[PDB]
RNA sequence: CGGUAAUACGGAGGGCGCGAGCGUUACCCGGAUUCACUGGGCGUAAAGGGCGUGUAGGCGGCCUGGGGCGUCCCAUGUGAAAGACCACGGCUCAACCGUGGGGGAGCGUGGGAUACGCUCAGGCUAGACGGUGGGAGAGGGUGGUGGAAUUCCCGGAGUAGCGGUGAAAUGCGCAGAUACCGGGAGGAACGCCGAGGCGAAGGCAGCCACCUGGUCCACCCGUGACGCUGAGGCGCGAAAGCGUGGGGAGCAAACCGGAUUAGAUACCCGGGUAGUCCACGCCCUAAACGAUGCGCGCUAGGUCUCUGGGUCUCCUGGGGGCCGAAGCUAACGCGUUAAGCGCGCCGCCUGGGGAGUACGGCCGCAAGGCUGAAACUCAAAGGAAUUGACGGGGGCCCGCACAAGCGGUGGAGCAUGUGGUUUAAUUCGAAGCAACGCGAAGAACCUUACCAGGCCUUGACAUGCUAGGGAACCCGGGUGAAAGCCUGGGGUGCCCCGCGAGGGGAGCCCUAGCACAGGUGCUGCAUGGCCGUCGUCAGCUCGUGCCGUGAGGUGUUGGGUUAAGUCCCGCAACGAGCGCAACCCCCGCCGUUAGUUGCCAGCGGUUCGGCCGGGCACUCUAACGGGACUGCCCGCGAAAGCGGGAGGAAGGAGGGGACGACGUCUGGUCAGCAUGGCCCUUACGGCCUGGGCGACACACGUGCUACAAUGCCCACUACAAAGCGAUGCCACCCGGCAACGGGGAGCUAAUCGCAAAAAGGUGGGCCCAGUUCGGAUUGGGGUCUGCAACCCGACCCCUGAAGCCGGAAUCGCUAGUAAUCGCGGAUCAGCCAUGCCGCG
RNA sequence: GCCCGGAUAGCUCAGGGUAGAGCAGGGGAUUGAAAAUCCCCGUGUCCUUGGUUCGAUUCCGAGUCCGGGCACCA
RNA sequence: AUGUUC
């Protein structure tokens, strides 16, 4: 029981909110709830698209949602039919009118959430974990990270004895607060239960 | 292997291997260099005999000759056939068979060779012995005799204790001890010298004499291989022990007493018999050890030391040590004093246990010794080194760890969590630290997981399919504690055939049917996620190099320094990473920006409160900056750093946060959530009313209030900070002793409100008392929240418990800390909050 | 008879204002647990009688029952 | 001085 959330630890400094609206005591409750049914819906529908973030701004009580995906192709559709329904789905579940923008994650191999998702997906499909891990870290570093770490939880290869295979390269100065360590976490659901996957990508300083 | 995902069980499919076969068991060889001739070993793994002496035996320097036994050569005989091997052939092949061919050690016979081994003969002098001359020595034996000490006896002198331990007592002592002195006895051992020396081993220590063994050196004088080893045999063999005698001071198994202890048949104390001593005779063992058989040769050196010799600053011999060449070694280590390189000879080993046991035999007075198995059993036993961890090991070093302090807990009441008991239920989890005011940041119903009873089933919730009706919605009627069951009505916007009949229609809702939902049911060793914890401890690693057969090591052992693997110095390492620190927030000094709702210094006015003008200066607010870095000075130091000083609001990490390395704990959580697997399906799901989680003979944790005078009560008067609030904070009136109730402004809040801060200060009262201390308990009468306060709420208003500072123990804190005093918040209708998180 | 002493909790024993250790039970405390160890409980006609005293288990005098020693018993 | 166990 230790190591605090490398995002939570940064926030004001180095790394920004995933939702930036204001609301007073009477309001926050309901907009936060929305935010959440929003993220939740997009979290499962845009799985194939490899989504890293779901940033949510909110102004004249109107809602813009930026979805930072690796595969905008997938969220869009051929000529944008899929993103049609997506804009209508959100509107169905929120009593409101919601801008849904896409944004290509330029390099998906520096997106901790994606790197993490990829390894998780690999595991879900009976891939060797140690290798999967080690490779993920090679990909991250090749893509110019100053350092990267990846951690698969336990029940690797299906064992009775749960474990925790880690693997890392470069600097990952978690105590350093100017660092800019993206962090990411996906599940592997398996016949044999869940393994969790943590990726840390270190990108630079100041 | 098998514990609920089993490539190891059983079956299936699939595969691999052989195939008229494939497996099994048994036995032999192999692997097994694990009986080692080829081809092993004995320092610590199993293995050097306890040491001499020596018999058989094994082995034997240099030269010359004779012999020709070994040995080698040639011929020749023999080595039957079959088999084996080569060729060619017969059965259609092959198996099987034929024919021919080459082998083959052995042994006989003849002839020959003579290097080596043997043998006979002669020779040599390098091995061995001897002569002469010198030497060192706890080598042995017998005799004596010297002083110190202990004990005892006789005295003297002197008196109250001595002795002894962790502490004591036993014991000795007034019948005179202990300490001191004189006289004497007797036994044992020899201080200093003293570390080395001698001996084959065991072992050997005052001095003197006699007897006696080994050994070294020199001259190079004599003999001339006379040598090495040595199964047996013979002798020697520590200590204990045995027999007969002696002797007996000190010591001291056993034993007796005293302690210690749970016991103490021990360790500590006081005594004490064998024995320890001597003679003679036995015993024959041992960690009898260098755990290393003896002899010889050969392979760098350095250094200390004993003892000889030397035209003596070094050489030369013999011993004893330490370090090391090459080499060996599993490693440790050994290394001209070999565990190296070699030859001779002896001894011994062959997994562990059983067991040095049994049986037998030999020896012994006995104790016992020697020789020495097997059954059965295990899958190891084991050596060395490595990384850890551990220590009632060491050094160095840290933390409120102790210590120094100050205040508490443990006692009392009560609050609260827990054990337990109880109950229909008292849901469930947390268990040393790191469970127990913990999950719970809010249990009357709800919560709520439990109990009772009454009710519901495609369901309180989801996705979707079939179908007559209904298709939104909304209202009452019975029966009920409520759920629910039964009921009767108001009444179709919408897509659309349409100008309508009438008729398609999608939401949506009920009925039945189908899939499915639901499960706080189990497993925290199936899990994720999150957390605790060691520990904010100073660590944990890596890349390449180098060291090691290797695990691994170095780096990161050392010296200094730091809060720190912080830094410095050093170094077969040079770097790096996760940690430390820094980057982030708060607090402390100042600046710039900004001037309302905040401030009010100087004005002017004034119903006093900055109220109005003005103004933002100061205070604030809050955003951005500056500022500290051992930077400067002195001293110490090689440096890092340290001591001190100055300036500065602030130093030596300025004070607090946030922050928790690789890992540990099969830690915690399936009951927050997620999740594999297991389980429930008119019930383990779901709804309700009521009860319970609040029970109380007990025990424990954390707290609160106290026991009072540095106090308590009443009046009056001050000085905060951080928060919170528009179905809420509530000013201010009024009524009420009061909780509160009626009114009722202001406040989307730097505006108005909660708000009184309390301790403090000033008055007064109490006068040491179970009290004007303390406020438990209990009776009544009220208030408020809420459908409802019986179990079970808080608050107000009129009994007055225990408790006179708390046993063994035990906690917190190092400075704006502890101690004490209040204030706010989350949860929340209300509150059992004395808790928690914060604020001053 | 005479002189001495004893009688205290269930047992074994300590002692002018006051009743105690010990053993056994039970709570605690210590330990990570368990033992060992430490602490706290509840227990009396203080033999009986009269005296002294404000107070007696304590001092006095008597008496009973024991123990020691000595008398002696019609 | 002593001071056991899992
Ligand atoms: Mg063999
Ligand atoms: Mg061998
Ligand atoms: Mg051994
Ligand atoms: Mg051995
Ligand atoms: Mg020997
Ligand atoms: Mg001979
Ligand atoms: Mg001769
Ligand atoms: Mg001569
Ligand atoms: Mg002997
Ligand atoms: Mg002897
Ligand atoms: Mg004798
Ligand atoms: Mg005897
Ligand atoms: Mg003794
Ligand atoms: Mg031996
Ligand atoms: Mg050496
Ligand atoms: Mg026998
Ligand atoms: Mg202390
Ligand atoms: Mg108490
Ligand atoms: Mg459970
Ligand atoms: Mg666990
Ligand atoms: Mg548990
Ligand atoms: Mg467990
Ligand atoms: Mg409770
Ligand atoms: Mg009292
Ligand atoms: Mg008093």
Residue A172 Cα to ligand 13 midpoint, Å, equals 72
Element (H, E) at A55: strand A51-58
A197, A156 in Cβ contact below 8 A? no
Residue A1 Cα to ligand 22 midpoint, Å, equals 16
Question: Could you tell me where the DSSP H helices lie in A57-196?
Answer: 72-76, 82-93, 112-124, 129-142
Q: By three-state DSSP, how is residue A57 classified?
A: strand
Please give the method by which this entry was determined. X-ray
Residue A1 Cα to ligand 23 midpoint, Å, equals 28
Residue-range domain boundaries for chain A: 16-106, 107-206
Element (H, E) at A152: strand A147-152
Closest CA to A96 of A27, A38, A19: A38
Element (H, E) at A101: strand A98-104
The bound ligand whose nearest atom lies closest to the alpha carbon of A154 is 20
Q: By three-state DSSP, how is residue A99 classified?
A: strand
**Superfamily of the domain at A16-106:** K homology (KH) domain (3.30.300.20)
Domain A107-206 has CATH 3.30.1140.32: yes
| HSE-up (13 A, CA, CB side) for residue A169 | 13
Fold equal for A16-106 and A107-206: no
């Amino acid at each position: 029981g230790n190591k605090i959330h490398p995002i939570g630890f940064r926030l004001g400094i180095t790394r920004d909110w995933e939702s930036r609206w204001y609301a007073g005591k009477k309001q926050y409750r309901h907009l936060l709830l929305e935010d959440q049914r929003i993220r939740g819906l997009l979290e499962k529908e845009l799985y194939s698209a490899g989504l890293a973030r779901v940033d949510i701004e909110r102004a004249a009580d109107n809602v813009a949602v930026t979805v930072h995906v690796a595969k905008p192709g997938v969220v869009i559709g051929r000529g944008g039919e899929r993103i049609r329904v997506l804009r209508e789905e959100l509107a169905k579940l929120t009593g409101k009118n919601v801008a849904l923008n896409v944004q290509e994650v330029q390099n998906p191999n520096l997106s901790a959430p994606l790197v993490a998702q990829r390894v998780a997906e690999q595991i879900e499909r009976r891939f060797a974990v140690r290798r999967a891990i080690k490779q993920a870290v090679q990909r991250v570093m090749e893509s110019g990270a100053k350092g990267a770490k990846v951690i698969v939880s336990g029940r690797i290869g299906g064992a009775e004895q749960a474990r925790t295979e880690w693997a890392a390269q470069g600097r990952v100065p978690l105590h350093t607060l100017r660092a800019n360590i993206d962090y990411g976490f996906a599940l592997a659901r398996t016949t044999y239960g869940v393994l969790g996957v943590k990726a840390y990508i270190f990108l630079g300083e100041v």
